[PDB]
Amino acid sequence: GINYVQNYNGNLGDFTYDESAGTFSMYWEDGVSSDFVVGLGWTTGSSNAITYSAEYSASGSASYLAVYGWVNYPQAEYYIVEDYGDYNPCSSATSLGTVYSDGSTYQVCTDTRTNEPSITGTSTFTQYFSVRESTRTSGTVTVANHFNFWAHHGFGNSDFNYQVVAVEAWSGAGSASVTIS
């Protein structure tokens, strides 16, 4: 029951959505050289499972097909990356382990962003990432398995701000078309 539309620089590409149908698409087939994050979701996140289906094409693009959201305190930005382009965030970040969920292992890592854009303006926050090793573009994400693993490493696992299925990119070109079931 979609009630939040995520649009962070959606203007850099062609973002279309229908909250009633639970569908959206994003074309950035001419390329982008700045960050966008677009998607559909809920004003308050939870640990309920999310089922989605997508056509996602982002080879040669620093991009993610991800469940994305925030925790108010301790302030954290989080990603459960189902598929991605050229860039793996865990290659550079502090490794936390591996979690197994919904048919694959996920590399888990963390990072700290200082004086960067956040749900409160500009601030310092922690990032948690689960990056799928056998990437896919459809399935169920049992969000609770990721939240419970990250909670061992300081993730607040309560006091949630928004949560969306999102497409992000900051370079390259591609397209995406997603349905949330």
Side-chain angles (χ1 to χ4, degrees):
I2 303 303
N3 68 350
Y4 178 70
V5 176
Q6 169 61 201
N7 192 329
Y8 181 76
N9 299 336
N11 84 84
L12 304 184
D14 176 26
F15 180 42
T16 302
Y17 56 93
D18 178 348
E19 310 99 280
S20 299
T23 54
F24 69 88
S25 41
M26 180 60 164
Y27 293 90
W28 68 102
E29 226 131 52
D30 296 316
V32 176
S33 44
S34 181
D35 198 48
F36 69 79
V37 187
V38 297
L40 293 182
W42 308 274
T43 44
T44 307
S46 72
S47 59
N48 297 164
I50 291 167
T51 301
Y52 71 95
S53 190
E55 307 258 40
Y56 173 67
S57 181
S59 44
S61 188
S63 177
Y64 305 137
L65 169 55
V67 167
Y68 173 75
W70 288 78
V71 173
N72 293 318
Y73 191 72
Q75 195 179 70
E77 181 180 51
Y78 68 75
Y79 297 74
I80 300 169
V81 188
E82 296 290 279
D83 203 351
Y84 56 105
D86 303 340
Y87 181 79
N88 186 312
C90 285
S91 69
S92 311
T94 313
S95 184
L96 238 47
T98 312
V99 75
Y100 181 87
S101 201
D102 311 289
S104 177
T105 21
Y106 286 73
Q107 312 161 62
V108 181
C109 60
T110 191
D111 200 5
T112 296
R113 301 280 97 216
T114 54
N115 310 320
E116 270 189 52
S118 71
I119 49 171
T120 56
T122 284
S123 58
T124 296
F125 56 92
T126 311
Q127 293 182 297
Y128 290 91
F129 303 83
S130 282
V131 184
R132 191 183 244 244
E133 287 185 347
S134 317
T135 61
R136 16 113 105 156
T137 58
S138 60
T140 302
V141 180
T142 301
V143 179
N145 292 160
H146 296 274
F147 284 3
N148 289 156
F149 184 81
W150 301 339
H152 302 325
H153 302 285
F155 180 72
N157 202 12
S158 57
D159 197 14
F160 297 110
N161 204 291
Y162 67 82
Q163 171 177 260
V164 296
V165 178
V167 177
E168 174 166 10
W170 57 95
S171 75
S175 46
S177 187
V178 185
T179 301
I180 299 166
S181 318

